Task: inverse folding
């Protein structure tokens, strides 16, 4: 009785370049939420335990991929959107919420699958005389769409005037967050980083810290190739994949072949 | 330049996904050039050039093709205003590489490159606030076909190089392959074809032709053969 898997084989890319999460999280200064700093994490190993080493967090709230055990996944691309907002607005970063930040500074997609990490920074981002470096937008003519950065500071139209000059009825579009060390937690600054995850099987990968093992063929094997897992028998394939293809499908649109992350050999998968 | 229209191009099919299939009739809904679509033919002879380069709309996506023997077309400019006020994408080809740069450019009134070496200053006076650079191999008698799609922040370039021994487009099917996926997040509404027209060191210079079509959401059947090469397709909206 060997119809059940008799081996467990993990195959991941041989990448020793750690993802620069420390540098984005430990940046000396963060961008204003109205003009958040959007960076990209790729071609690296996605070890997420460093986040707990970085700081205690106010909220972690992964959406879509709700488990926080992210060390077993490979993403095609990872983006990191960093900004500083006040504590009372942290809840507005969830995909389905509204308010000054969700609507005018950082709208997140409704089907967002990533993680929203919040860190209390009251001792770093609050100056004795007041920290006036950070700005947020409060006035727009329409709601902000997901992941767009509205940078312009052009004075916001008011009443029925051409609106030239400020004061009588026109407003500067940004208000600023005058942070004080003596404010309560609701008004303290928080550094928020949104990690946007693209889970699209694995045409490209940013894999967590998994240790690859040797391939086993002609046996019933529990396999994990990049972000794709399953049970089956691996055999040498005679299929001609194009240089850009990583997988294959049967006539019923289920996986029947993979490209090995280390050798690029094409293997067919037969269910046990 | 001067634009004729063409109604008979049965071209522009590309692999819609990154998954191998063979001996499969696959139904998919994606942005494709419709069959028998209205495709504009640009024909310029180079005193400097037949007429100063036009700027074309991007719409949903662009099908670009040329059968050029002089190798003058070596890049494209994509963006909104195509001036210093916004960020834009510059894709250029040269004898050794393909240079893709995303920056806030101030392209000069005359977009076309001067080839005499090559001088970057003939395309733009200056650029700043650069965020992306990438280098690929040259994209190179032969008909060169490209599809430029701007979807969910990614600028996806597909291409194929098909030999031609006659004057007319070959009557047959050839699918385009993915070339490069650029994670830019760029808003593209307008683009221009960049012509690397050299000074003949009022002067006579080589001609350049190209065809431009637009993609539309359509449902297609794609016939995948034994090798996973698409050999035929049916436009279900026709
Ligand atoms: C926005 O993120 C980018 C990362 O893509 C930051 O650029 C890095 O800044 C650090 C600062 O110490 C440098 O050491 C890195 O070499 C930079 N890398 C790149 C690719 O630029 C940028 O500084 C961030 N900006 C803000 C305002 O936080
Ligand atoms: C961040 O950088 C500073 C620079 O001196 C370093 O001391 C600190 O340990 C780093 N990590 C954290 C979590 O602050
Ligand atoms: C590392 O991965 C590359 C991917 O193509 C592979 O060619 C190379 O052989 C791997 N390294 C070793 C030591 O096998
Ligand atoms: C139709 O296609 C042929 C090539 O098969 C081409 O020569 C001809 O010019 C096309 N029709 C028009 C409207 O020019
Ligand atoms: C195609 O579109 C152009 C304008 O872009 C127009 O001049 C031309 O007549 C159109 N051709 C047909 C057949 O509709
Ligand atoms: C092509 O462009 C790249 C981009 O920097 C450059 O490094 C290379 O030298 C260029 N080649 C020629 C022949 O101009
Ligand atoms: C670059 O962007 C910053 C954003 O504040 C702007 O102030 C600066 O003038 C820009 N520089 C350019 C486009 O050269
Ligand atoms: C892209 O540009 C068009 C034309 O200027 C504009 O209508 C649209 O809102 C822009 N979108 C973004 C996300 O910048
Ligand atoms: C300029 O290009 C023409 C063809 O377009 C060619 O015949 C001529 O020799 C070229 N001159 C130089 C100096 O490259
Ligand atoms: C696909 O299989 C062979 C393998 O190289 C290829 O040359 C030919 O074009 C195709 N053959 C058949 C029978 O489809």
Result:
């Amino acid at each position: 009785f060997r119809v059940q898997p008799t081996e467990s084989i993990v195959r991941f890319p041989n990448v020793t370049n750690l993802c620069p999460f420390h540098e984005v999280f430990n940046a000396t200064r963060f961008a204003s939420v109205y003009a958040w700093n959007r960076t990209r994490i790729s071609n690296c190993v996605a070890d997420y335990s460093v986040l707990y080493n970085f700081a205690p967090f106010f909220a972690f709230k992964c959406y879509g991929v709700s488990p926080t055990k992210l060390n077993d996944l490979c993403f095609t691309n990872v983006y990191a959107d960093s900004f500083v907002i006040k504590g009372n607005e942290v809840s507005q970063i969830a995909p389905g919420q509204t308010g000054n930040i969700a609507d005018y500074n950082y709208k997140l997609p409704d089907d967002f699958t990533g993680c929203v990490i919040a860190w209390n920074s009251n001792k770093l981002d609050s100056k004795h005389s007041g920290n006036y470096d950070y700005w947020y937008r409060s006035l727009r003519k329409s709601k902000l769409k997901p992941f767009e950065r509205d940078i312009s500071t052009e004075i916001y139209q008011a009443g029925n005037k051409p609106c030239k000059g400020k004061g009588p009825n026109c407003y500067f579009p940004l208000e600023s967050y005058g942070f004080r060390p003596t404010y309560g937690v609701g008004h303290q600054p928080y550094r928020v980083v949104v990690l946007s995850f693209e889970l699209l099987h694995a045409p490209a990968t940013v894999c967590g810290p998994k240790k690859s093992t040797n391939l086993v063929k002609n046996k019933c094997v529990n396999f994990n190739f990049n972000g794709l897992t399953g049970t089956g028998v691996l055999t040498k394939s005679n299929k001609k994949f194009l240089p850009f293809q990583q997988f294959g499908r049967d006539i019923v649109d289920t996986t029947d072949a993979v490209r090995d992350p280390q050798t690029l050999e094409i293997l067919d998968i037969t269910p046990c | 330049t001067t634009t004729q229209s063409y109604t008979n191009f049965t071209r522009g099919v590309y692999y819609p996904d990154k998954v191998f299939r063979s001996s499969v009739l696959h139904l998919t809904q994606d942005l494709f050039l419709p069959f028998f679509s209205n495709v504009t033919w640009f024909h310029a002879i180079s005193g400097t050039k037949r007429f100063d380069n036009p700027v074309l709309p991007f719409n949903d996506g662009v099908y670009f093709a040329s059968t050029e023997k002089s190798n003058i077309i070596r890049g494209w400019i994509f963006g909104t205003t195509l001036d210093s006020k916004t960020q834009s994408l510059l894709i250029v080809n040269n004898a050794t590489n393909v240079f893709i740069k995303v920056c806030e450019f101030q392209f000069c009134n005359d977009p076309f490159l001067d080839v005499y070496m090559e001088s970057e200053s003939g395309v733009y006076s200056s650029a700043n606030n650069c965020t992306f650079e990438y280098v690929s191999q040259p994209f190179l008698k032969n008909l060169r076909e490209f599809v430029f799609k701007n979807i969910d922040g990614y600028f996806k370039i597909y291409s194929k190089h098909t030999p031609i021994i006659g004057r007319d487009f070959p009557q047959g099917f050839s699918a385009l392959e993915p070339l490069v996926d650029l994670p830019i997040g760029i808003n593209i509404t307008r683009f221009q074809t960049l012509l690397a027209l050299n000074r003949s060191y009022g002067w006579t210079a080589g001609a350049a032709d190209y065809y431009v079509g637009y993609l539309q959401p359509r449902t297609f059947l794609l016939k995948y053969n034994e090798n996973g090469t698409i050999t035929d397709a049916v436009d279900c909206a026709l």
